[PDB]
Amino acid sequence: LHRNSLIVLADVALFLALYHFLPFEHNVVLGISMLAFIAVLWLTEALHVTVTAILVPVMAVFFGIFETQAALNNFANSIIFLFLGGFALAAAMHHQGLDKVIADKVLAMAQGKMSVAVFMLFGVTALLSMWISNTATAAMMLPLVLGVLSKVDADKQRSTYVFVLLGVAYSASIGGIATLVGSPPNAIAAAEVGLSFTDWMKFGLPTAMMMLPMAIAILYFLLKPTLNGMFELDRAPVNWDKGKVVTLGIFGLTVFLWIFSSPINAALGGFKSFDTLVALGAILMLSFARVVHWKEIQKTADWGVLLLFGGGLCLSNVLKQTGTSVFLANALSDMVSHMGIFVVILVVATFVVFLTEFASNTASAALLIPVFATVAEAFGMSPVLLSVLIAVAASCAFMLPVATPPNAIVFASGHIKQSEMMRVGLYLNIACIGLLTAIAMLFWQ
Amino acid sequence: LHRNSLIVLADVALFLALYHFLPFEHNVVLGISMLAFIAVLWLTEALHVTVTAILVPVMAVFFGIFETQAALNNFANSIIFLFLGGFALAAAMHHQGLDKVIADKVLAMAQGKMSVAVFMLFGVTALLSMWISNTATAAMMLPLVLGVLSKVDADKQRSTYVFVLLGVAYSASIGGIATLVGSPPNAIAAAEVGLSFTDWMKFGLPTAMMMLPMAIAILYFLLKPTLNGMFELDRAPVNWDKGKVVTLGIFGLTVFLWIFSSPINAALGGFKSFDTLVALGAILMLSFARVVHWKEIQKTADWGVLLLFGGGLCLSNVLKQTGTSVFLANALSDMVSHMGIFVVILVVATFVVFLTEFASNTASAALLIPVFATVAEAFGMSPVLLSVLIAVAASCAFMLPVATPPNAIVFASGHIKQSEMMRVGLYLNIACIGLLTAIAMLFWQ
């Protein structure tokens, strides 16, 4: 007796209508009907996206596509455990106060001036969300801006809060674009096409360090904050201790292995998923050093996202087995030939941004990469390009906080203006699309 | 600089010593060394058992036994999602207050007399832990006994608390013996040998309904509580509401499918893991009815146990591939022939009970079933028998609460006597061993 339940029932009706009123082959029609069913559920949020991910194997099995174990085996792909290692590092830092220490040392780097402390905050948020996550990285940095701006006349000068708030909220999202960890869509792209950490970083890091300064510029030239005073916090300086240095060293070692995985993996025997093995080894070393415990890790890690990966992967395998992907590519050849690759990528990224406005970034990614990339497999036209393009565009979200939990946390202070944030996000969306397409045209050809 | 770290290093030393000072084949020596390594870690609790489970695939891969994905695929076995569905049902009941309602209706069944309310409490705990878990089932029932016994002179008459406390603590553990859900060891046994819900229930339910009355008798004839008065609670009677009835119907439907899975699965096409599919469908129906949400499920479900299943399964597959199991069975043939099956099962169950005293029940099970059952595979001598015997014995634990979280919760009231509980557990252990072996000799032959 709820709109969500009505959505599910109408969605079942659409599934049946497609099943019995489509003049295609049995496997392709089945896959298209499943894709529509799951698409509506993920976009409309009638059920939780994790629950829909759990539903994908069940309907896949009951239609005789996969065996139960084969369908469920996509919930233990190596990328899932890679993100698990990322969450473990996050738990270690939040448990040891290392993120607070990093912010305090940065803020000691800036003597007392706001005009650059915010910039170092954005940069630190990028470097930190690169390896961890977005929502976590926003939570601890919000109290900092409140303390810094507690003496700035918060009744007529609120754009300064808005700058030092949205810059962090978007810096985390852009920091997720440089490394596989930090943003679930990037993992999904790597999962479908097959990607190493270093190669994906060569594709992502330039985009991150070029997108982020642009976004900061957009805000600064749109809204005009002061950034001319001085701040003098009253809080005490936290200093180094055992555990903090050890987990810092483990973090550096893990990054070093993830970067030089190809030579190391070649020397050690050439294992298939050395990045994931490094993630698990990081968990083992943290447990060995007793810097964190599994209950912290269990409380911190979002297992719903890890199951949503399984949903996306099972959907991709379903579309691959059923032939829907090649059927779609063959039907879309005429459109992709008439319209150049330039306009093709413009419409794809534009559609992604308008899609995550009224949807979840990760759910939309898990819906989209299996379609276009498998389509791009048949086309030729390296699907790594489209996969990363969609994955990065998913992280670029600048809409009403219901779209994005980071925006929810940062909005929750309760003084930011709805319409102003919409217009700011509009300009940011436009700039991201243009810059992304320029990168793909010039660098990736 | 901790005893746990010293244990890990000495454990590495034992691994290397076995590697280079054992005159067996390379694969069998490798598997034995891994088994010793993991055994010590799980028993000594140097690291968390979940962390050790994560370690098993890493060392398996780095020694060239499995590919990374093949090793990790044991973390998504269908049994794991079966237990996930159990946790989802638990979340629904704790969210809707249904367990409180069940206890209140039972306590309305008993007008005001303690002499049978405790017995219905033990029985309800059995029927409830059959489908859910142990620790959860203990938590809500402890306040009940406090309220009932708040007027019983808790300075000289404490054995009444002890009866109404340990009976529940052990009723949950025994309730886990009748169904696959409720106790992780039973899932591990089903996983290795291959077992359906109904068949395992034919093996387990008689044992549960025969073990539980015996245990209650042991306590009643050892310690003498009064159970002759009347209680008059002051709390209000909670009544039925929407959601409670719906999740009750879903629980009944899920049980009905799990029982009549074989005919239904035969009719529907004969799917491989219809029990797991029923579990997932239960999650879907709960989400569809909006009686529970994924954040309740995520907070409730213990993902460490689900990963520990993957550790046990990967260890079993490692021992199977390496030939350690058949090597062990061939070396132990002379002992198993000289000593009859009767004495073999007596020593096995006796060793299990003395093992879980200073260890975790589930970790010990994940250590033991892969050894004996795969050994029993080669012997003949149906390994279902040994697997279930070890799995049920693991649930039978009556030792210091550090062994068992249910005992931790029930002890935490702080008036129970250490030595008395040890002696009570000793007699209970003895009776469980004897009765279990009688069942295996007579019924299972």
Residue numbers in the entry:
A (entry chain B), B (entry chain A): 18 to 462
Sentences from the study reporting this entry:
VcINDY is a Na+-dependent dicarboxylate transporter that imports TCA cycle intermediates across the inner membrane of Vibrio cholerae. The VcINDY protein is a homodimer consisting of a scaffold domain and a transport domain. Substrate transport of VcINDY is driven by the inwardly-directed Na+ gradient, with dicarboxylate import coupled to the co-transport of three sodium ions. Here, using a combination of cryo-EM structure determination, succinate binding and site-directed cysteine alkylation assays, we demonstrate that the VcINDY protein couples sodium- and substrate-binding via a previously unseen cooperative mechanism by conformational selection.
VcINDY was therefore purified in the presence of 100 mM Ch+ as the only monovalent cation. Unlike the VcINDY map in 300 mM Na+ for which 3D classification converged to a single map, the VcINDY-choline dataset yielded four distinct classes at a resolution range of 3.6—4.4 Å resolution. The 3D class with the highest resolution was further refined to 3.23 Å resolution. Whereas the overall fold of the protein in Ch+ remains the same, Na+ densities within the Na1 and Na2 clamshells are totally absent. While the VcINDY Ci-apo state overall structure is similar to those in the 300 mM Na+ (r.m.s.d of 0.672 Å), the model exhibited significant changes near the Na1 and N2 sites. The tip of HPin and the L10a-b loop have moved away from the Na1 and Na2 sites, respectively, with the carbonyls of Ala376 and Ala420, and the side chain of Asn378 also rotated away from the Na2 site. Notably, HPinb near the Na1 site and TM10b near the Na2 site and their connecting loops showed marked decreased density in the cryo-EM map, corresponding to the increased flexibility of these regions. In contrast, in the Ci-apo state the NMR-style analysis clearly illustrated the structural heterogeneity near the Na1 and Na2 sites. Instead of converging to one structure, the simulated annealing resulted in an ensemble of structures, with the greatest variations occurring in the HPinb and TM10b regions. As the 3.23 Å apo map imposes C2 symmetry on one of four classes of particles in ChCl, and all four classes are different, the degree of flexibility of these helices in the Ci-apo state is likely to be even greater. Such helix flexibility results from the absence of Na+ interactions with residues in the clamshells and with the dipoles of HPinb and TM10b.
